[PDB]
């Protein structure tokens, strides 16, 4: 009634990049009420997704659960599947991987049963994400591997391949490229590097045939990372440079920094310690500009190593010591966990951070319009 009118204003506002407004309208909408439980389900779903977008994952979870419940009572299978998929993604963010699996699985099963192809795909992707998050959530999230990380990332791989084959036979490209990204990453972490090279190459190809802003940067980055883990230091450096150009255009201090750090790491591998020290210095200036103490510490360390390799004693001492203090802040030092004496080299790699970028969540949508 007015519930509908209100909800439509909310949907309009969210659509137009004003989530907080839209949410206040959805809240008024629920507060008024409707006997049309399909559209009430829509209001619940949209609220769920809006709160997700706003990084209030608690409310997100709640509203998606009401949506799920609702769907189930009125026996709306499709509603139930899409609500369940949103629940799965919310849970993934909250780190409840088991329920997230149960939920995204349900999404898939139902979507199959309803002979929905697009939906089936989406749920497959999500399952790949859940297994990717799960895989990363044990110890250090890098490319190196207990039986658990193995199982979960391998599972991730499979799901990424079911998805990939199926959005291959549906002629979705944006989808295929997202799956290629995340599959490149999952290979990357798994140790199967050439495959990662392949798939990353593909994701690059599609971000290219769309002209994707702020998302070419990331295929660059991940290619660079794989090459660094093979030996192609030089070419990787080129890639990261690209990424830094881009990032400094778009005004993102973050990927600016990470691009610098990655770069410096590459010239330290390239034995050009001067350019290395420069890049890591820029990263130091960005990092301490943003109250990023852990970043500041890692810069301190990398620079200490580069200076030491360069012959400069004083700067090495100073930076090593600053790094000590910064470590003392972020933890205990009665076991001296801060002290890492092995330097970055072709035989190390694991000694420095190389940030990789995963894609995104493909959410599930109800509309009243």
From Swiss-Prot:
Compartments it resides in: Cytoplasm; Cytoplasm, Cell cortex; Cytoplasm, Cytoskeleton, Spindle pole; Lateral cell membrane
Transmembrane annotation, as ranges: none
Renumbered residue ranges of the record's region Important for interaction with NUMA1: 1-332
Modified residue annotations for Phosphoserine: 111, 327
Resulting phenotype, residue 203 to A: Abolishes location at mitotic spindle poles
TPR repeat feature ranges: 3-36, 41-74, 81-114, 121-159, 177-210, 217-250, 257-290, 297-330
Tissue specificity field: Ubiquitously expressed.
Family: Belongs to the GPSM family.
Implicated disorder: Chudley-McCullough syndrome: An autosomal recessive neurologic disorder characterized by early-onset sensorineural deafness and specific brain anomalies on MRI, including hypoplasia of the corpus callosum, enlarged cysterna magna with mild focal cerebellar dysplasia, and nodular heterotopia. Some patients have hydrocephalus. Psychomotor development is normal.
Miscellaneous comment text of the record: Dysfunction of LGN is associated with the phenotype of multiple micronuclei due to chromosomal mis-segregation and defect in cell division through mis-localization of mitotic spindle regulator protein NUMA1.
Quaternary context: Interacts with the dynein-dynactin complex; this interaction is inhibited in a PLK1-dependent manner. Part of a spindle orientation complex at least composed of GNAI1, GPSM2 and NUMA1. Interacts with LLGL2. Interacts (via TPR repeat region) with INSC/inscuteable. Interacts (via TPR repeat region) with NUMA1 (via C-terminus); this interaction is direct, inhibited in a PLK1-dependent manner, prevents the binding of NUMA1 with SPAG5 and promotes spindle pole organization. INSC and NUMA1 compete for the same binding site, but INSC has higher affinity and can displace NUMA1 (in vitro).
Function: Plays an important role in mitotic spindle pole organization via its interaction with NUMA1. Required for cortical dynein-dynactin complex recruitment during metaphase. Plays a role in metaphase spindle orientation. Also plays an important role in asymmetric cell divisions. Has guanine nucleotide dissociation inhibitor (GDI) activity towards G(i) alpha proteins, such as GNAI1 and GNAI3, and thereby regulates their activity.
Name this protein carries in UniProt: G-protein-signaling modulator 2
Annotated source species: Homo sapiens
Source species taxonomy: Eukaryota, Metazoa, Chordata, Craniata, Vertebrata
Residues of the full protein shown: 22 to 357 of 684
């Amino acid at each position: 009634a007015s519930c509908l009118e209100l909800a439509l204003e909310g949907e309009r506002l969210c659509k137009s990049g004003d989530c907080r407004a839209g949410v206040s309208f959805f809240e008024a909408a629920v507060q008024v009420g409707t006997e049309d439980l399909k559209t009430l389900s829509a209001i619940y779903s949209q609220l769920g997704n809006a709160y997700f977008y706003l990084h209030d994952y608690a409310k997100a979870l709640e509203y998606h659960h009401h949506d799920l419940t609702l769907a189930r009572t009125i026996g709306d299978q499709l509603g139930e599947a899409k609500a369940s998929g949103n629940l799965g993604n919310t849970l993934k963010v909250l780190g409840n991987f088991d329920e997230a699996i149960v939920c995204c699985q349900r999404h898939l099963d139902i979507s199959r049963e309803l002979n929905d192809k697009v939906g089936e795909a989406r749920a497959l992707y999500n399952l790949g994400n859940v297994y990717h998050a799960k895989g990363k959530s044990f110890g250090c999230p890098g490319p190196q591997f207990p039986e658990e990380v193995r199982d979960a990332l391998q599972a991730a791989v499979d799901f990424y391949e079911e998805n990939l084959s199926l959005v291959t036979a549906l002629g979705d490209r944006a989808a295929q490229g997202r799956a290629f990204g995340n599959l490149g990453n999952t290979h990357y972490l798994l140790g199967n590097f050439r495959d990662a090279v392949i798939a990353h190459e593909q994701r690059l190809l599609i971000a290219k045939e769309f002209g994707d802003k702020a998302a070419e940067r990331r295929a660059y980055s991940n290619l660079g990372n794989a090459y660094i883990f093979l030996g192609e230091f030089e070419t990787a450096s080129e890639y990261y440079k690209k990424t830094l150009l881009l990032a400094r255009q778009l005004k993102d201090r973050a990927v600016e920094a990470q691009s610098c750090y990655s770069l410096g790491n590459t010239y330290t591998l390239l034995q050009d310690y001067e350019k290395a020290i420069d890049y890591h210095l820029k990263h130091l200036a960005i990092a301490q500009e943003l109250n990023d103490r852990i970043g500041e510490g890692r810069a301190c360390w990398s620079l200490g190593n580069a200076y030491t390799a360069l012959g400069n004693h004083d700067q090495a001492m100073h930076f090593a010591e600053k790094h000590l203090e910064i470590s003392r802040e972020v933890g205990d030092q009665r076991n001296a966990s801060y002290l890492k004496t092995q330097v970055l080299s072709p035989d190390s790699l694991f000694t420095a951070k190389f940030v990789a970028y995963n894609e995104e969540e493909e959410e599930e949508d109800c509309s009243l319009a």
